[PDB]
Design a protein around this ligand. Structure first.
Ligand SMILES: CC(=O)Nc1cccc(Nc2nc(Nc3ccccc3)n3ncc(C#N)c3n2)c1
Length: 328
């Protein structure tokens, strides 16, 4: 049986109303207050437009939900309400609906985000350290609130490079952490799914997000997005193993008394561990310093229990200049 090494009893001492998201009662605003300016994004669960709050004439983000079960939508909302004002946590402005179809839309703060596919490549060594650091404040904060974002990826990290402002967005897949509960493992995006998810280990925790963060951090310094480029869940676990080696995996499996499956276990095969430096070339050599490697290595661990916690990561020597900067 596995659990969390930190923040494990947050939802405990906390009244049921904090996590009993199904007892939530949505207080709907007026749909008109917000007008769609232009489309900017879309997911398999919604469409996203830059909008304008007709009263204050200020920009906003309108997330029009697609047929979602009501329980699911109360989860994304309750969690959002619970994290309001948290370091770098995207702010939920309003909840509205279309009277006829009952189509709901969540109004969020607006961020003039620069696509990561284009942004990331120009970031400097320090920018990387800086923004990862900011993303870490968001994770440590939600983890400390009893919430797993379970879907960390560039697409969900909005960055206004001009203002050097960052926000962790889209808490649809997020979930409340309960000591001992099992969770669906069809979360996160293949390229960021932790090994636990690829081996059916159901009782995971905040740790899952640190693996994803690690994948994100890896792609950034090694300039290889995604880092673990697989074609499907099976290929995902394999692509990982060809890097961390199968022994760590075998040890991982055996420690939690888990057992892969024929085609899977046979698919993975046997692989030696490939050192992190084997991924250094001339397009990233100026970003793969020892502190970077040491920090990455402490995030990308098979065993979710070994991985650094959000709080510890922010103190790793890798971020010392960012921290020293902050103390001014
Ligand atoms: C909204 C959500 O949960 N997920 C979701 C799903 C797909 C795309 C997006 N997109 C998306 N895009 C932006 N900003 C933006 C993007 C490109 C150019 C200019 C501005 N923002 N800004 C805040 C939020 C926020 N919050 C957001 N979401 C969001």
């Amino acid at each position: 049986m596995s659990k969390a090494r930190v923040y494990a009893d947050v939802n405990v001492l906390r009244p049921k109303e904090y996590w009993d998201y199904e007892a939530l009662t949505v207080q709907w605003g007026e749909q008109d207050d917000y007008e769609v300016v232009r489309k900017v994004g879309r997911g398999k669960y919604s469409e996203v437009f830059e909008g304008i709050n007709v009263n204050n004439n200020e920009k906003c983000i309108i997330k029009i939900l697609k047929p979602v079960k009501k329980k699911k939508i109360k989860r994304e909302i309750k969690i959002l309400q619970n994290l309001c004002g948290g370091p770098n946590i995207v702010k939920l402005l309003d909840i509205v609906r279309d009277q006829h179809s009952k189509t709901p839309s969540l109004i969020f703060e607006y961020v003039n985000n620069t696509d990561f596919k284009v942004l990331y490549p120009t970031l400097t060594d320090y920018d990387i350290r800086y923004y990862i650091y900011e993303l870490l404040k968001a994770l440590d904060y939600c983890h400390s609130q009893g919430i797993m974002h379970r879907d960390v990826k560039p697409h969900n990290v909005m960055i206004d490079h001009e203002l050097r402002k960052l926000r962790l967005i889209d808490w649809g897949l997020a979930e409340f952490y309960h000591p001992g509960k099992e969770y669906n493992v069809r979360v996160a995006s293949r390229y960021f799914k932790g090994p636990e998810l690829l081996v059916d280990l159901q009782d995971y925790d905040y740790s899952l997000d640190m693996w994803s963060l690690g994948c994100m951090f890896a792609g950034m310094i090694f300039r290889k997005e995604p880092f673990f480029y697989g074609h499907d869940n099976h290929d995902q676990l394999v692509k990982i193993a060809k890097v961390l080696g199968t022994d760590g995996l075998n040890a991982y499996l055996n420690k939690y008394r888990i057992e892969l499956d024929p085609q899977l276990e046979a698919l993975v095969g046997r692989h030696s561990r490939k050192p992190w430096l084997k991924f250094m070339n001339a397009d990233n050599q100026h970003l793969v310093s020892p502190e970077a490697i040491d920090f990455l290595d402490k995030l990308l661990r098979y065993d979710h229990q070994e991985r650094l916690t959000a709080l510890e990561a922010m103190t790793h020597p890798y971020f010392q200049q960012v921290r020293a900067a902050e103390n001014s």
